[PDB]
Structures are given as structure tokens and as C-alpha cells.
Amino acid sequence: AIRKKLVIVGDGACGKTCLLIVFSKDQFPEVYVPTVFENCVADIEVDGKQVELALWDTAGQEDYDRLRPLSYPDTDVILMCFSIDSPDSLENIPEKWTPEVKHFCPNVPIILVGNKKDLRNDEHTRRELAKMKQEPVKPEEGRDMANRIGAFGYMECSAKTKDGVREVFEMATRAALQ
Ligand SMILES: Nc1nc2c(ncn2[C@@H]2O[C@H](COP(=O)(O)OP(=O)(O)NP(=O)(O)O)[C@@H](O)[C@H]2O)c(=O)[nH]1
Ligand SMILES: [Mg+2]
Numbered sequence: 001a002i003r004k005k006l007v008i009v010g011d012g013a014c015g016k017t018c019l020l021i022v023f024s025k026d027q028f029p030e031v032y033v034p035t036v037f038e039n040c041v042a043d044i045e046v047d048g049k050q051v052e053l054a055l056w057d058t059a060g061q062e063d064y065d066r067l068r069p070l071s072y073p074d075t076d077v078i079l080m081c082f083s084i085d086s087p088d089s090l091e092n093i094p095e096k097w098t099p100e101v102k103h104f105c106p107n108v109p110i111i112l113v114g115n116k117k118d119l120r121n122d123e124h125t126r127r128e129l130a131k132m133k134q135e136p137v138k139p140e141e142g143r144d145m146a147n148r149i150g151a152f153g154y155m156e157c158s159a160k161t162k163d164g165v166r167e168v169f170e171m172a173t174r175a176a177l178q
Contacts, residue, residue, distance in 0.1 A: 001043070001050040004176040006169075007071055007105075009097055010081030011089040012060035015115035018159040019081070020055045023169050028160060034059050046173045053173065072104035077176035079168065080110050080151065084137045085119040085129070090145060098149045109175035111153055112146040113168055114139075118158040 008016045017036055021029045024042040035057035042053045056071045058064070080097050082089040093112065101110065119125040120136045129135055139156060146154035152175040157164030 001052045002177070003052045003054070004076040004173065005054045005056060005074055006077050006079060006172060006176070007056045007058065007075045008079040008081060009058050009068070009101060010060055010079075010113075010115075011083070011086070011092050011096075014060060014081050014083035014086065014089050015159055016060065016079075016081055017057055019079075019113075019115060019157065019165065019168070020057055022159040022162055023165050024055060026162075042169070044169060044173050046170060046177065049177070051173050051177070053169065069100075069104050072101075075105050075108050077172045078105060078108050078110045079113050079172055080149075081113045081115050082137070082142075083116045083119075084114045084142075084156070085116050085122070085125045087129070087134050087137055090114075090137050090141065093145055094149060109178065110149065110151040111155060111168065111172045111175060112142060112149065112151040114142045114154070114156045116158060116160070117156045117164060118161050 010016055020036050040055040044051050044053055058068050058071050078101055082093055142154045153171050155168045155171055157168050
């Protein structure tokens with residue numbers, strides 16, 4: 001089987017760890033871990049080809065800025081995440097994550113991922129965002145950002161409902177196979 005390394009990055013609490021676990025274990029996590037720490041290699045088939053996907057979780061907090069580059073060597077595809085309930089995490093795509101990622105992984109394909117799609121129409125989410133004069137990220141905002149950073153594609157998903165999750169990792173696999 002083809003062996004590809006995947007690294008997921010994005011702001012603290014935007015759903016990275018839950019996405020890896022929903023995809024690799026088909027279950028939304030109960031217990032809390034900052035990063036998936038036990039082995040995390042998932043299988044996927046794309047156009048007849050069997051692909052082995054090593055999932056490298058990272059921490060989004062600035063506390064971990066010193067150590068996160070230790071995960072970047074030999075990366076084949078990057079999942080760059082924001083949360084649809086957080087326009088701030090989108091604005092950190094060009095201001096924080098693309099600079100860091102493209103510095104250590106200069107030509108590694110990027111899939112831009114908007115997590116927590118199930119909160120786009122969530123009442124508490126919109127009330128929280130409205131009090132800051134904000135609304136959830138619209139799909140055209142994610143597309144525009146993806147074009148702007150040169151991502152191979154833009155995908156939306158919800159780890160909670162699993163909607164879009166498999167597609168995210170299929171798209172990432174296609175990018176890495178290039
Ligand atoms: N509604 C909703 N909540 C989600 C979804 N994915 C994750 N969450 C929730 O969002 C919170 C953060 O998720 P988590 O995966 O820990 O985020 P992270 O990006 O890995 N955080 P960190 O960088 O600190 O490790 C948790 O409370 C989790 O249950 C989703 O698709 N929908
Ligand atoms: Mg995490």
C-alpha cells in the first residue's frame with residue numbers, strides 16, 4: 001500500500017483531534033486528549049489504489065509553537081483547519097497557519113478544511129457571534145480563502161455528524177498522490 005504522511009494544523013479548539021478520531025475510529029471522542037498520542041495510521045482507497053494514511057495531530061495553541069515544527073518533516077499533505085463557528089480562526093489561516101506551514105513544508109499540498117459545519121445554523125453559535133458583530137463563516141469565504149492560499153481544495157465537514165469527513169480525507173489523499 002502507498003504510505004502518505006498527513007499533518008493537521010489550525011487554531012486551538014477548532015476540532016482537529018475529533019476529526020482525526022471520527023475518521024480513523026468512526027466515533028466522536030468522549031475523553032479529552034490535546035493530540036492523538038497512540039498510533040494513528042488509517043487506510044483509504046482512492047481509484048483502486050490502497051493508501052496508508054499516517055495521521056499526525058498537532059496542538060493549535062501558541063504555547064506549542066516551539067515544538068509543532070517537529071511534526072512537519074516528510075509531510076505529504078496538510079489539512080489546514082478553521083472552524084465555521086469562528087471567523088477568527090479563518091482569519092488566522094493567512095495570518096498564522098499558512099506562513100508557518102509554507103515555511104516548513106514549502107510545496108506540500110494544503111487542503112483547507114472548515115470544521116463544525118453543524119454549527120452554521122446553531123442558535124447559541126449565532127447569538128455568541130452576533131454579540132461580537134459576527135456570523136458563521138459562509139462557504140464562499142472558505143472557497144475564497146482556499147484560492148488565496150493556493151490550497152488544492154476547500155472542504156467543509158462536521159466531525160459531530162460525520163458529514164463531509166470521509167470526503168476531506170479522500171481529497172487529501174488525492175492531493176498527496178500527485
Ligand atoms: N459542534 C461540534 N463540535 C465539535 C466538532 N468537532 C469538535 N467539536 C468540539 O470542539 C471542541 C474542540 O475539539 P478538539 O478536537 O479537541 O479541537 P482541537 O482543534 O483538536 N484542539 P487543540 O488544538 O487544543 O488540540 C470539543 O469540545 C469538541 O467536542 C464538530 O464537528 N461539531
Ligand atoms: Mg487537539
